Each structure stands twice: as structure tokens, then as C-alpha cells.
């Protein structure tokens with residue numbers, strides 16, 4: 129048990145936006161109606177809540193020390209124990225990446241036991257939408273098998289606590305594992321197992337009939353492609369195939385049916401072209417009702433095919449091939465932004481085992497649900513209430529206008545007039561990945577933002593409702609940068625540190641740019657003073673040096689303070705942060721080096737001894753009129769990692785979260801000038817989460 133020190137009870141909720149990232153799997157529990165789980169590649173897992181019609185994040189106890197476990201390569205249930213759920217966790221398998229873990233729960237994901245593995249888990253690498261790689265033996269639940277992408281097949285006999293390599297399985301890159309539950313009776317190890325591996329020479333699909341002791345290549349399987357996913361029904365093994373593990377680059381594929389008892393193969397592909405197949409679901413109560421989804425059929429768009437006669441005929445559900453006309457109806461009322469995307473990366477699709485007319489499928493930006501597959505045409509709902517997977521690279525909270533503005537990976541800039549409803553206009557700036565956003569303190573209608581295609585930046589004069597792109601950008605710019613722009617308090621001057629170019633300044637809203645003088649390093653995250661439009665700040669985490677401009681960004685000088693340094697790969701922990709309403713009041717985070725505070729425009733700084741480590745800091749409305757703004761800190765205080773608030777200028781802190789609300793990897797944190805106690809947190813793959821004191 130961790131020590132439960134003094135804290136204020138807070139309520140944490142996602143800013144409602146909807147989806148935004150790659151959901152990599154959905155699992156209906158076959159023996160409890162209403163029990164459904166979903167896995168993602170960078171945002172943990174979810175459990176459906178029918179009572180509140182929303183998804184519940186079940187991995188927010190992951191923290192900065194094990195945030196890689198937010199990558200869910202596989203999720204598995206136990207058909208004979210509805211309270212159990214397992215997860216195969218990890219993001220990358222490269223040499224610089226750590227090992228993965230198996231997480232086991234006996235309370236439907238409310239709490240987890242973490243079992244670290246000796247192998248790396250690629251929950252955010254190629255083929256992450258294949259699966260499921262983790263399986264519970266459907267007849268003897270103490271047995272689990274785990275397919276990995278770099279270390280072959282592993283078996284557990286103690287419900288995932290310990291894992292042993294199955295040395296008899298030679299291939300090392302596994303796509304999925306699937307049990308044939310009819311091959312044994314309850315209480316005995318299931319004898320028939322199929323494993324699909326990444327191999328396009330005709331040796332992707334393997335079969336065992338002795339519980340995994342011996343293995344053999346399935347004769348007659350297709351060549352030039354790999355087995356992607358499988359379903360078993362009525363003695364048939366239905367397998368989707370593609371010439372790439374996905375989610376991209378599939379230019380060939382098929383759907384085949386394998387008769388388990390005699391080894392016969394029948395091609396039941398609905399159509400063939402320069403694309404593959406992956407998603408497949410056989411109706412758990414009707415083996416002749418099957419759905420399959422194309423993969424990387426980019427033009428006109430991906431297709432979902434439905435059969436009710438076991439693949440003899442297929443009906444296209446999404447669009448009509450005869451004239452490429454869309455026929456399915458898509459309801460994005462819950463998240464109007466999502467209409468800028470078309471369903472793609474449909475690597476998983478599942479029919480409800482308790483209603484054959486209900487199904488769901490995943491995309492690269494959220495979950496879609498159909499409640500009547502028998503309708504002609506079908507209607508699909510963007511069903512992602514509570515499911516937030518966006519990466520907020522930067523967020524700002526102006527004191528007037530919108531409550532929040534977000535610069536999101538992949539999806540663009542958002543303007544949030546309400547925290548409990550997705551923005552009615554959708555995306556505010558449709559530019560894809562946006563890495564920076566700032567507003568002018570004294571004129572918060574003036575907002576600037578950066579992105580990753582030329583001219584890499586844009587500005588707004590009406591609080592982000594309308595935008596226009598920069599007429600020019602600094603020479604050599606290859607990207608907008610990360611938290612790399614600052615606009616003066618009066619809105620007349622912009623300092624920009626883009627990728628591939630030296631830090632520059634503009635006096636004409638981006639119509640022309642001039643390189644900043646003084647020798648300040650490039651690629652820093654620049655900060656504007658909230659009062660004095662001639663003062664800008666730029667912190668160098670590697671040298672531990674603060675740079676200050678007193679001439680509106682024309683030139684910078686290096687302050688004498690020797691801050692604790694940080695390695696280049698940890699430079700995200702170094703930042704300088706100016707306080708609204710207080711000229712020259714800046715706070716500097718140095719990661720494990722602590723938190724420093726300057727009240728003379730950076731001329732000198734003092735260590736905040738109450739803070740052990742500081743990763744990001746924000747400021748909000750003071751508790752009483754005339755008091756110092758409330759300080760919101762993500763870091764370590766007295767050995768406790770979490771989120772803290774100080775109401776006395778940084779001398780004492782109150783923890784405003786608990787160990788179940790750490791959210792994995794927090795990118796930054798902001799307060800709110802209009803509401804005391806309100807705290808905005810940007811978390812990797814978990815969108816923006818805001819916290820308020822819980823009413824007593």
C-alpha cells in the first residue's frame with residue numbers, strides 16, 4: 129500500500145471531443161451481456177458502461193514510470209470467469225525500448241496486477257491491429273498463450289503470473305493465436321491451437337493438435353500473403369490475408385475458409401484488388417453471418433462486406449462498387465469533427481454475441497457501431513463517448529472567448545466553447561498535426577498556431593473561429609515545432625522556433641520573419657511575458673540556461689543562472705512559464721533538477737525547495753482576490769508522483785489527484801483564469817482531462 133497523505137478530493141473528466149486515435153481491438157464477452165472491452169495503441173484500454181452509455185478508461189493508474197503499458201497489443205477475457213480480463217502491454221520493440229508486461233484483473237479492470245515480462249511488446253508498431261495475440265484457454269482458464277512480435281510464443285499455466293517460452297514454436301513474429309474450444313471439454317487443456325505469423329511464403333498459418341507441444345505448417349494455405357486474423361465456427365477456420373501486417377501498405381489479400389477436419393481450402397474473398405483484408409467477425413450465433421473489412425483500400429474508401437450464406441454471396445455495406453456511391457449512413461452528431469475522416473484502418477470488427485443485428489468496428493480515429501445490420505442501408509454511429517485518444521501537443525486556456533484551445537496530433541486545432549460537448553464546428557483549423565498554440569494575454573482574441581506543412585503556421589483575430597495562414601515562414605523551416613511559438617501580450621509580435629530554422633520574430637503577423645540575434649539556441653520552446661510585450665523567454669534544458677529578450681524578440685541574452693541540466697532526450701522536462709498578470713514572474717521546470725522561480729524577468733532564479741521534481745507547471749485563478757494565482761504542478765513532491773496545487777505561491781502543496789488518476793504520460797498542465805480549482809491536463813493518447821474539486 130502507498131502512503132495516503134493529505135489531498136483534496138478531485139473529480140477528473142475528459143474534455144469531450146471524441147475518439148481521435150487508433151483503436152486496435154474490441155472484445156465482446158461471450159458469457160455476460162453488456163460486457164465489452166476496447167484496446168488502443170497509445171491510450172490504454174476501455175470498458176463499455178451501458179448504464180451511462182460511454183466507455184470507461186481502465187488504465188489511468190499507469191503513470192510516468194510505466195506509461196509504455198498504455199500500448200495495448202492485445203486484450204483477452206475468460207469465458208468461464210466474467211470478472212477476469214488480461215492485457216498484453218507495451219509500445220515498442222526497438223533497442224531503446226523497455227520490456228512489456230501482462231496486466232491481470234479480477235474486477236473487470238478496476239485494479240490490475242502488473243507482471244513484467246522479459247520480452248518487448250509492440251503495441252504501437254506495425255501489425256498492432258492484428259490479433260488477438262493473448263488468449264485464455266476456453267476450457268481450462270489457468271492456461272494462457274501469448275504471441276509476441278520478436279520472441280515467438282509463450283505459455284502460462286498460472287493465469288499470466290509466469291511465462292515460459294514454447295520452444296517447439298520456431299517462428300518469432302506472431303500475428304495472432306486462436307483456440308478451437310471444441311477440441312477439449314471443460315477442465316482440460318484445449319488441444320487444437322492455430323497461430324498466424326508474419327510470413328508471406330506460405331508458412332504463416334501453423335496448427336497444433338496436442339495443446340501446443342508440436343506444430344506444423346497448414347498445407348494448402350495461400351502464398352504471397354500472411355494470416356491476419358481468424359474466426360472458428362462450425363468446424364471452419366475463416367482467415368483474412370494480406371501482404372502486409374498493416375495498418376498500412378497492404379496491396380494484396382484474400383479471405384479463405386479452412387475445413388479443420390479434412391484440411392480443405394475454399395477462397396471466399398468478396399473482391400480482390402490492390403488491398404488486403406484483416407477485420408473479420410463470424411456471428412457467434414449464426415456461422416453463416418460474417419463481416420469482413422478491407423485494409424488499405426484508400427480510393428474510393430475501405431469496404432465492409434456482409435454475408436448471410438457463409439460467403440457464397442457478399443453485400444457491400446459502406447459503398448456500392450457499381451458507381452462508388454456511399455450508401456451507409458454515418459452519424460457524427462456526437463463528434464462533428466470526425467466527419468473530416470473516412471473509415472479506415474478497419475482492422476477489427478465484431479458482431480454482438482447477444483444481438484446478431486448489432487456490431488462495432490474500429491478505425492484510426494475511433495469506434496463505429498451499427499444497431500441494425502439488417503437495415504438497408506445500415507446506419508453507423510460514432511460511439512466514442514468517454515473514449516478520448518488524442519495527443520494534445522499544446523493547450524491554452526484564454527481568460528475570455530473559448531474555455532480551451534487544443535493543438536492535436538493528426539487532427540488539427542480545436543476550439544472548446546464547452547468541456548462537456550464536442551466542438552460544434554468540428555476542427556477549428558484543418559491542418560493535421562498541430563504542435564503549438566498561443567494567445568496574446570492582453571488581446572486573447574489573437575491566437576497563433578503551428579503545424580507540419582508549409583507555411584507551417586497561422587493566426588486568428590477572433591479567438592480561433594476564423595484563421596488565415598502565415599504569408600511567409602522562416603527560411604529553412606521544415607516543421608512548425610512543438611510548443612514553439614509565443615505571441616506578445618499586445619498581439620503585435622510573434623517569436624517562433626520552428627524545426628529546421630533558427631528562432632525568428634515577426635512584427636506583421638507572419639508576413640515577414642527575421643532571425644533573432646544574440647546566439648540563442650534554436651528549437652527551444654519560447655514563452656511570452658503575460659504583461660510586457662517586449663519580454664520573451666527561452667529555456668535551454670541541455671545547458672540549463674535561460675535566455676531572455678527585452679526588445680520584443682529582436683535579440684536574446686543568456687542569464688547567468690546555472691539551472692540543473694537535462695539530457696537531450698529528456699529536454700521535454702525543461703520549460704519556462706510566465707504567470708498571467710505578473711510581469712517578469714516566470715517558473716522554470718528542470719525535471720529531476722526541481723522547480724525554480726524568478727520574479728525579476730529571469731535575471732536571477734531561486735530553487736523551490738518544496739518540490740522534488742517538476743515536469744510541467746500551470747497557473748489559474750487565485751482562491752481569494754489579491755492572492756497569488758493558484759499553481760498547478762505535475763511532478764514529484766515528497767517522493768509522491770502526481771498532480772499538485774499550491775495556494776500560497778509555491779511553499780506548500782496539496783495533491784489534487786490519486787494513484788488511480790495519473791493518466792500515463794502527462795505532456796503539460798494549465799490552470800483556468802475564470803474558475804478556481806480548475807485544472808487542464810494533456811495526457812498522451814488520453815486527450816485533455818480536466819479536474820475540479822469534488823463537492824462535499
Ligand SMILES: OC[C@H]1O[C@@H](O[C@H]2[C@@H](OC[C@H]3O[C@@H](O[C@H]4[C@H](O)[C@@H](O)[C@H](O[C@H]5[C@H](O)[C@@H](O)[C@H](O)O[C@@H]5CO)O[C@@H]4CO[C@H]4OC[C@@H](O)[C@H](O)[C@H]4O[C@@H]4O[C@H](CO)[C@H](O)[C@H](O)[C@H]4O)[C@H](O)[C@@H](O)[C@@H]3O)OC[C@@H](O)[C@@H]2O)[C@H](O)[C@@H](O)[C@H]1O
Nearest residue numbers: 149150376426427468469470492493537538539560561580
Ligand atoms: O509521427 C508523427 C507524424 O506522423 C505522420 O503520419 C504518419 C503516421 O500516421 C499515424 C496516424 O495515421 C492515421 O492514418 C493515416 C495514414 O497514416 C495514412 O497513410 C493515410 O493515407 C491516405 C489518405 O488518407 C488517402 O486520402 C489517400 O488516398 O491514400 C493515403 C495512403 O496512401 O490516411 C490515414 C488518415 O490520415 C488522416 O488522419 C491523420 C492525419 O495526420 C492526416 O493528415 C490525415 O490524412 C488526410 O486524410 C484525409 C481524409 O480524411 C485526406 O485524404 C487528406 O488528403 C489527408 O492528408 C491514423 O488515423 C492515426 O490514428 C495515426 O495516428 O504513421 C503512418 C504514416 O503513414 C504517416 O505518415 C504525420 O503525417 C505527421 O504530421 C506527424 O504527425
